[PDB]
Design an enzyme around this catalytic site. Sequence first.
Site, PDB file in Angstrom:
ATOM      1  N   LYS A 147      60.987  53.133  45.348  1.00  0.00           N
ATOM      2  CA  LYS A 147      60.613  52.996  46.782  1.00  0.00           C
ATOM      3  C   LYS A 147      60.727  54.361  47.471  1.00  0.00           C
ATOM      4  O   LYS A 147      61.750  55.046  47.268  1.00  0.00           O
ATOM      5  CB  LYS A 147      61.505  51.966  47.481  1.00  0.00           C
ATOM      6  CG  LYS A 147      61.096  50.514  47.275  1.00  0.00           C
ATOM      7  CD  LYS A 147      60.033  50.037  48.242  1.00  0.00           C
ATOM      8  CE  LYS A 147      60.551  49.821  49.651  1.00  0.00           C
ATOM      9  NZ  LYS A 147      59.458  49.461  50.587  1.00  0.00           N
ATOM     10  N   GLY A 148      59.701  54.729  48.243  1.00  0.00           N
ATOM     11  CA  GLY A 148      59.694  55.904  49.134  1.00  0.00           C
ATOM     12  C   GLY A 148      59.328  57.185  48.407  1.00  0.00           C
ATOM     13  O   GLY A 148      58.797  57.101  47.282  1.00  0.00           O
TER      14      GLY A 148
ATOM     15  N   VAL B 106      60.568  59.865  46.395  1.00  0.00           N
ATOM     16  CA  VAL B 106      61.685  60.189  45.456  1.00  0.00           C
ATOM     17  C   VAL B 106      61.130  61.007  44.281  1.00  0.00           C
ATOM     18  O   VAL B 106      61.773  61.016  43.216  1.00  0.00           O
ATOM     19  CB  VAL B 106      62.397  58.901  44.993  1.00  0.00           C
ATOM     20  CG1 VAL B 106      63.008  58.155  46.169  1.00  0.00           C
ATOM     21  CG2 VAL B 106      61.475  57.977  44.209  1.00  0.00           C
ATOM     22  N   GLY B 107      59.992  61.681  44.484  1.00  0.00           N
ATOM     23  CA  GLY B 107      59.273  62.456  43.453  1.00  0.00           C
ATOM     24  C   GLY B 107      58.911  61.604  42.248  1.00  0.00           C
ATOM     25  O   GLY B 107      58.997  62.119  41.118  1.00  0.00           O
ATOM     26  N   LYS B 108      58.517  60.349  42.479  1.00  0.00           N
ATOM     27  CA  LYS B 108      58.212  59.351  41.419  1.00  0.00           C
ATOM     28  C   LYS B 108      56.977  59.802  40.629  1.00  0.00           C
ATOM     29  O   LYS B 108      57.028  59.758  39.386  1.00  0.00           O
ATOM     30  CB  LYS B 108      57.995  57.969  42.044  1.00  0.00           C
ATOM     31  CG  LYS B 108      57.794  56.830  41.053  1.00  0.00           C
ATOM     32  CD  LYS B 108      57.789  55.464  41.704  1.00  0.00           C
ATOM     33  CE  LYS B 108      56.656  55.263  42.690  1.00  0.00           C
ATOM     34  NZ  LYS B 108      55.331  55.518  42.073  1.00  0.00           N
ATOM     35  N   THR B 109      55.919  60.222  41.330  1.00  0.00           N
ATOM     36  CA  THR B 109      54.608  60.626  40.750  1.00  0.00           C
ATOM     37  C   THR B 109      54.773  61.906  39.919  1.00  0.00           C
ATOM     38  O   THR B 109      54.029  62.052  38.931  1.00  0.00           O
ATOM     39  CB  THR B 109      53.543  60.778  41.843  1.00  0.00           C
ATOM     40  OG1 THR B 109      54.108  61.536  42.914  1.00  0.00           O
ATOM     41  CG2 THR B 109      53.057  59.444  42.368  1.00  0.00           C
TER      42      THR B 109
ATOM     43  N   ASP C 191      49.112  53.546  43.155  1.00  0.00           N
ATOM     44  CA  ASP C 191      49.356  54.215  44.461  1.00  0.00           C
ATOM     45  C   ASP C 191      48.009  54.436  45.148  1.00  0.00           C
ATOM     46  O   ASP C 191      47.134  55.093  44.585  1.00  0.00           O
ATOM     47  CB  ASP C 191      50.118  55.528  44.261  1.00  0.00           C
ATOM     48  CG  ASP C 191      50.516  56.240  45.544  1.00  0.00           C
ATOM     49  OD1 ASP C 191      50.730  55.552  46.560  1.00  0.00           O
ATOM     50  OD2 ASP C 191      50.617  57.482  45.513  1.00  0.00           O
TER      51      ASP C 191
END
EC number: 3.6.-.-
Lengths: 328, 328
Positions: A25-26, A28-31, A56
């Site tokens: 969630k948000g 958080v440098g996920k990508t 996304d």
Amino acid sequence: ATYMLPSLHDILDQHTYKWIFFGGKGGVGKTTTSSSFSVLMAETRPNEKFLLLSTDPAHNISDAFDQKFGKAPTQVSGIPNLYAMEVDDNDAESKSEGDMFGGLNDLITCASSFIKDGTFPGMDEMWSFINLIKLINEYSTVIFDTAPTGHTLRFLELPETVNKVLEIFTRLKDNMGGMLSMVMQTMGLSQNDIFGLIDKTYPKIDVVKRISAEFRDPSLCTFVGVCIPEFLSLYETERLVQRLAVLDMDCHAIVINFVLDANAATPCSMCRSRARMQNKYIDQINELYDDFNIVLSPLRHDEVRGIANLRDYAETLIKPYRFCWSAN
Amino acid sequence: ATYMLPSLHDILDQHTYKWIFFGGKGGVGKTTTSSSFSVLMAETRPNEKFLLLSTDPAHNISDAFDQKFGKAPTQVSGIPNLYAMEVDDNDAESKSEGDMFGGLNDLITCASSFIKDGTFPGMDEMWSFINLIKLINEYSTVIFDTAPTGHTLRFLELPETVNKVLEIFTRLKDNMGGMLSMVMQTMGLSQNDIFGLIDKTYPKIDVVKRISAEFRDPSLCTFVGVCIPEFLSLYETERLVQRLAVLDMDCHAIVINFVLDANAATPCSMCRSRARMQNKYIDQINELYDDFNIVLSPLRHDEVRGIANLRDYAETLIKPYRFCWSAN
Ligand SMILES: [Zn+2]
């Protein structure tokens, strides 16, 4: 303590995987984590083919690689065997096949109204996944990058919906509670049309059920949580880990991003305090998720853009970075 | 741009207020802002009396002041006219009065089952507030510090519940839909007992309705949002502002905490990046909430403890701090 290694090496080594999800969630440098891992996984196994799949809507993967992607899987420039696409001729198939899933969607809504107490999930959530399976060359593993907001478990609650779709199917063909007659009257369809529609759709409902059962198999599929050292970021991954537990989804890996490499020895006073603030939230994770691989990814000056930096970022996912609070 | 001043001076000047709420999901230094404001508001008006009211179960206000508080309001050491307590002889009143609110709770549940479609909010949420009013010396203004997690609008949805309690009352006394007879049979109570119970409780239901109507009055009551420059922190205050809008609650002030005073000129590279990360989220607030007082509170080395530091922190709430990106 520190029973589990702070690395994603177990997941990179285990080639038995087919589906690797990345939820967080948000911002958080996920990508960055989703992209960089796909690159690392691709160049370590140059023989086998891999897919990077983003749900996304912001198309943050195309900005990470610095290369546009569409609904069709496109080879990453400088990394063969790695294809990337954006979820959410073939249009001629879509019209003819869409008519049936239109008719099915009509039949389940009608059938639900006679039993389901003012309740019906759409067949679009399932139909969307049924389209996705059609475009799955033969990729060794598919890496999933879930949405950063809204409902991020859209494909992972299908086995709940199919069970009710198959419940309707049995009740119709058995004519239980006089549902078959009530549907035949309301929609004005023949018994041959209803049994005809069940026959054509069921095979595609079966592949969804079986592929969704592979997600529950921990040797075939795993989930990797992504978060940051911040109160709300913890709370969100608390819910995610609890939500994957009820779904029988495997999660034993978490990636903490934007970790400030500072302590009492850091000359910068403003950095010493922001390090103390982070320490409080990093410890909670260590105490709470003692049976998980907790990976600490250092804070970088410039945001990750291009295959060059993705590959560099990926180093700290497999070879744990030596922070200042590391004894050696 | 910057139509509105980045200060809480409007709220401090306007002495017409009686209720000031402070809401903020997670660790956003909310209790620091709640505490420090009460101190500042108290020492600026030494004649008038003020109350600081925390619904936080962690008792974070007692750690902020460095002084324990109970259910009874206690004078703050070094700041007369400021009393602090913890929400969630008099025990003899509680037994006798609790019996009726027991009987009422029984009567509304019973009455609801004959109309309300498997729905009933508890009378404890209301009864809790009815107890709170009893302990409201004559304080000029009461400063509310809401819970950091769970349901933080517990007192602000009472007018929805009373309307249904008063709906039941009318239906009983009019004997509409034969509810009076059905209640008299099931609970085995007399018409005198039912009309007797309505008579004794209604006055206390009326003061709740009227005090809850003062919260909707923007000259009597205002809400102050607290957040930090982080993705999830924004999203939470987006929902809060939208939730206060549907409740007819006034919010035109937001306090951004832990704001890093750095830019391109800052020698520390690790600070330059964390400043760029914050700038992205601080701008969104400025663009989005252009009709709100957006207060920027600088990052302090040590967390705020004692009346000394609370008073020092409070300076930047009323006199806007000169950051590096401030022209002057
Ligand atoms: Zn620094």
